[PDB]
């Protein structure tokens, strides 16, 4: 009653609208996984298409904010595209002002500031999308950063966003409890294994979209169906 | 319209004030309410001179009265600037009334909450008396009252106001005293008088100055019996 209908404090001090946005992210109905390695970072997520007519190519939840930065979005698609657009804008503005490519942490920070503005202001509903970012930082090497609608942003050795993020995170915690310093193939296998386990799907290569960054090749890249199938078949014979 | 009713009740609560119009004189009287044991009576005026040729008495909320008075003073000066002539009492009345129907910056109590008596001498020299309302309606009067008990005073003014009463300027002053005396039972220092005295600036009466006038009517009251 006027506390849940707008972004204002509950008696216990809680932002129900923000909780509802976190619910909306799961209402979107897709899962994303991110994991970090000594030499690389990767993203995996399912891109199951309901309609045959709908083009598989155009639909993807992986985007390029900059050449060296790749992101994945979950939740409401329109909000995801808007967030992606704003991230692109901020990155270019950063480059223009400061003469060097924005680091992933600063980008996540800016985006979280923007989400903060919506949660603070009543007129705007919180943007119901969650962004995970991968990039290579020269000082710290690969990095993974994740910004919620609320504005909390934190670095992650590995993480998940989606309907099964909880079980995914349990799996990732079990995996990283052992040190398991992962090379590129190991990170890829780890990510796909997390998703295949948590969704119980046993993906075909077309089902999933994969993007990575490497210290050798900082350029963000989207793996093609064939390389994805190579990784999956190497996994299956294991 | 709803704020207007609250404003009208507020001015109804306020201190009584009257004004009279005379041929070479206009008089303005307001009862001086007791303040406290320890307060200083200086700050409270209930009378203001918008210009040399205009005087005002308000009834109602003091702060809103302050705002109105300041705005009207600055308007009086700006009109003098643009027109090079003394402001007309009708004009400044029209502005103060017009100021009521802008509003507060938030529009809260769009009527500011005072009905005030504006009295002055025209540039041609003709005396004028007016009042304003929170509503914004403004009228002219031979004489009037505002504040608590004004209605009873208007009955007294209705009969007492006459060519004979106004024939003498000092009598023009004394009539105001009697009007207040009906309104206020203090019969003394609880009163404030101001007179324009055509072609000269407003001169507030001294406490002794009012005192002798009070004595004179008190004697004349004695003389009738």
């Amino acid at each position: 009653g006027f506390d849940r209908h707008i972004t204002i404090f509950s008696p216990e001090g809680r932002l129900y609208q923000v909780e509802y946005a976190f619910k909306a992210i799961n209402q979107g109905g897709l899962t994303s996984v991110a994991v970090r390695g000594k030499d690389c970072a990767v993203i995996v997520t399912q891109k199951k298409v309901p309609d045959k007519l709908l083009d598989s190519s155009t639909v993807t939840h992986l985007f390029k904010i900059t050449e060296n930065i790749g992101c994945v979005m979950t939740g409401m698609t329109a909000d995801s595209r808007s967030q992606v657009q704003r991230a692109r804008y901020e990155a270019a503005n950063w480059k223009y002002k400061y003469g060097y490519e924005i680091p992933v942490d600063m980008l996540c920070k800016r985006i979280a500031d923007i989400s903060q503005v919506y949660t603070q202001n009543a007129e705007m509903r919180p943007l119901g999308c969650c962004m995970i970012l991968i990039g290579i930082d020269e000082e710290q090497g690969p990095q993974v950063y994740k910004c919620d609608p609320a504005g909390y942003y934190c670095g992650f050795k590995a993480t998940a966003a989606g309907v099964k993020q909880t079980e995914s995170t349990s799996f990732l915690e079990k995996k990283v409890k052992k040190k398991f310093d992962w090379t590129f193939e190991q990170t890829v296998e780890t990510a796909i294994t997390c998703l295949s386990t948590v969704l119980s799907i046993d993906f075909k290569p077309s089902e999933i979209e994969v993007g990575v960054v490497t210290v050798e090749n900082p350029k963000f890249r989207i793996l093609t169906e064939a390389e994805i199938d190579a990784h999956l078949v190497a996994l299956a014979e294991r | 319209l709803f704020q207007v009713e609250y404003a009208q009740e507020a001015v109804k609560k306020g201190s009584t004030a009257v004004g009279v119009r005379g041929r070479d004189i206009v008089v303005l009287g307001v009862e001086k309410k007791s303040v406290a044991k320890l307060q200083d009576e200086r700050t409270v005026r209930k009378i203001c001179a918008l210009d040399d040729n205009v005087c005002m008495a308000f009834a109602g909320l003091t702060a809103d009265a302050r705002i109105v008075i300041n705005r009207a003073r600055v308007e009086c000066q700006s009109h003098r600037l643009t027109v090079e002539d003394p402001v007309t009492v009708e004009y400044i009345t029209r502005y103060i009334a017009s100021l009521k129907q802008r509003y507060t910056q938030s529009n809260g109590r769009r009527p500011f909450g005072i009905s005030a008596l504006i009295v002055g001498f025209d540039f041609d020299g003709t005396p004028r008396l007016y009042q304003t309302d929170p509503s914004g309606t403004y009228h002219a009067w031979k004489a009037n009252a505002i504040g608590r008990g004004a209605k009873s005073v208007r009955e007294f003014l209705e009969k007492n106001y006459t060519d004979e009463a106004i024939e003498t300027d000092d009598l023009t002053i004394k009539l105001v005293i009697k009007a207040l005396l009906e309104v206020v039972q203090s019969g003394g220092k609880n009163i404030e008088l101001a007179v324009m005295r055509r072609d000269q600036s407003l001169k507030i009466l001294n406490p002794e100055e009012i005192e002798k006038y009070v004595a004179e009517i008190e004697k004349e009251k004695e003389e009738n019996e």
Binding site: - | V35, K37, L38, Q39, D40, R42, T43, V44, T62, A63, D64, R66, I67, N70, T104, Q105, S106, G108, R109
Partner: protein, 228 residues
């Protein structure tokens, strides 16, 4: 009513008495020492409110005074300064966020001499020979109306009166110089002197009040005995 302030007019001067109090032991109290805020050389104020509200109100006031000084190169009159603040606090009333504090103002103006003013939260203001604000303002004004003589005040008598009414009103339960803040406005050599009372002078005044209370206690016990 977190705080209390007090003010008295004298023929030769004016003083502000405020209860320097610590809600909690951990509070440093070096920062909160300055209950008295100097608006300018010729004025001061004491606030019945939190330090933040006080800082903002005081800044508005100081800005106003310095603007008047910039225009005219004369120090501002107390009435005009208080009136500007009152007009602002009123305009907030007309926002829906009226100023929630009442202030004392003390100053010397050549036009009116020594003066003491009080500002209501509604924006209305009034001149007082002596008054208190904040906690137990009602008891304070009662004792002042009892113990104050119009025109008979001198700075010394007024100061002792302040100590007395503070002892009755404020909840210190024992006067300490650390626990009370006193400041006086005086005119010396044609210049306005705002001086906080030193801890030693405050201790001396406290001791005078204490011995006077003892001497009074002796008299009442004697008279009570004599009655029976």
């Amino acid at each position: 009513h977190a705080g209390t302030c007090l003010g008295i007019l004298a023929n030769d001067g004016v003083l502000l008495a405020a209860e320097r109090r610590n809600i909690h032991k951990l509070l440093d109290e070096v920062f909160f020492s300055e209950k008295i805020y100097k608006l300018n050389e010729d004025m001061a104020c004491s606030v019945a409110g939190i330090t933040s509200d006080a800082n903002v109100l005081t800044n508005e006031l100081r800005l106003i005074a310095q603007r008047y000084l910039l225009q005219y190169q004369e120090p501002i009159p107390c009435e005009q300064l208080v009136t500007a603040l009152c007009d602002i606090k009123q305009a907030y009333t007309q926002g829906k966020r009226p100023f929630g504090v009442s202030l004392l103002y003390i100053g010397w103006d050549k036009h009116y001499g020594f003066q003491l003013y009080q500002s209501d939260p509604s924006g209305n203001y009034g001149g007082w020979k002596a008054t208190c604000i904040g906690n137990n303002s009602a008891a304070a004004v009662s004792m002042l109306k009892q113990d104050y003589k119009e025109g008979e005040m001198t700075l010394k008598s007024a100061l002792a009166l302040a100590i007395k009414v503070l002892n009755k009103t404020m909840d210190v339960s024992k006067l300490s110089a650390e626990k009370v803040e006193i400041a006086t406005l005086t005119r010396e050599n044609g210049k306005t002197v705002i001086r906080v009372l030193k801890q030693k002078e405050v201790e001396q005044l406290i001791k005078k009040h204490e011995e006077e209370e003892a001497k009074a206690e002796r008299e009442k016990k004697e008279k009570e005995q004599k009655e029976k």
